[PDB]
Amino acid sequence: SEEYHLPQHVAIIMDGNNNVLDPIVEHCVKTGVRALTVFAFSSENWNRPQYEVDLLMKLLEETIHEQIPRMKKFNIALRFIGDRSRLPSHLVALMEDAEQQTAHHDAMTLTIAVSYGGMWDIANAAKQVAQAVSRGEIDADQINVDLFEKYVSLNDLPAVDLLIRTGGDFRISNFLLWQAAYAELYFTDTLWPEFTVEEFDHALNVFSGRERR
Amino acid sequence: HLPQHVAIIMDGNNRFAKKNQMQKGDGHREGKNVLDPIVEHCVKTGVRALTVFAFSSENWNRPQYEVDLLMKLLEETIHEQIPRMKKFNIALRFIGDRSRLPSHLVALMEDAEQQTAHHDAMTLTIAVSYGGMWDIANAAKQVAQAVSRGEIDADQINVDLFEKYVSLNDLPAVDLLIRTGGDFRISNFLLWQAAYAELYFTDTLWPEFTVEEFDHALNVFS
Ligand SMILES: O=C(c1ccc(Cl)cc1)N1CCC[C@H](O)C1
Ligand SMILES: O=C(O)c1[nH]nc2c1CCCC2
């Protein structure tokens, strides 16, 4: 194994909670990782008590505001995936501002999955395809993997080749089901608040074959 | 608590053949026998559904001689399983894109599923010419065909509606997924069905996989 190719698209399930991301985003830029996608808020997280949901909405508003100057300083594109119909209007307006101000940035793409689920993503892709059929734009017999995949979120980015799950659990928990179909899976007992750039870099090297698990 | 639906990625056949200095394809030949005690263990312990990744969408791009051996092994397996399904009261199912399989193998699959459809102790599913992406896109094609017939309003498509078109929708969700062979990957298997499944990865190559380790994997889930 002479050539050690790092992942092109890393996805992270940031579990173990019940500022960590900034040095990880900076390490992606340093090493040439093109995309980083993080699981901030799941479809399942709407089932938590209202005060918990309200607190996560405040943490999300806070994180985006703090990220916008960093995205501009480092020329990183900031994107969001998930169902926005269930989110507060001002948070949606903030998400739109962030993604519109950074859409042309080419250093890396940081995607934050908010009110997101792999199943929701897939069924939404199916809905848009069926809408195209209803509007007479396409015939349903043309629907195969090649057509359908274009409607799944982040299809323009490379496939997820490395999925990191912190917090000790061995599950994908309805995250990027489609996009991570061939991703190498890295599980760690390290809780998200304790997750380091040293361990993030080790996960990258496990993927490349430079380091062993 | 026992898992309701166990899925297995039976990897490591070729590595086993190389490790034990066997002939080309012998890993698949030895590997074919490993599932029988597992299937019997599932029935006797009360596992309701077992789904195995016998041939993937990606396996169509393997060397042709390997595709040939796998097609012959599938045909051999199905014949051998039909009397076993009748004895153990197991319903045998197949999932995957049948349009890509040999016509005679599809007739044999149809025979096996029809003759065992009334069995109710367990459901054994063999994923043949299968990929989670294929399954998902096929479910989207079927939803869109219903839209074209005027049966469904496209604006109404959501997770609850879509899930009904994905394979094994009448079975519980996969709650335990086992992968042998040392790789940490789902490799386009039951992407939808295993969305919340516990994952058990092992270095044990599939031909070396035992009922004892499988039983330990059930214990780990509980
Ligand atoms: O591992 C198996 C198997 C499946 C189901 C049963 Cl019941 C037994 C073996 N197979 C099927 C034949 C060829 C496949 O590649 C591998
Ligand atoms: O490539 C291998 O070594 C291997 N191990 N088990 C299987 C395969 C390929 C076809 C499905 C079952």
Ligand SMILES: [Ca+2]
């Ligand atoms: Ca048509």
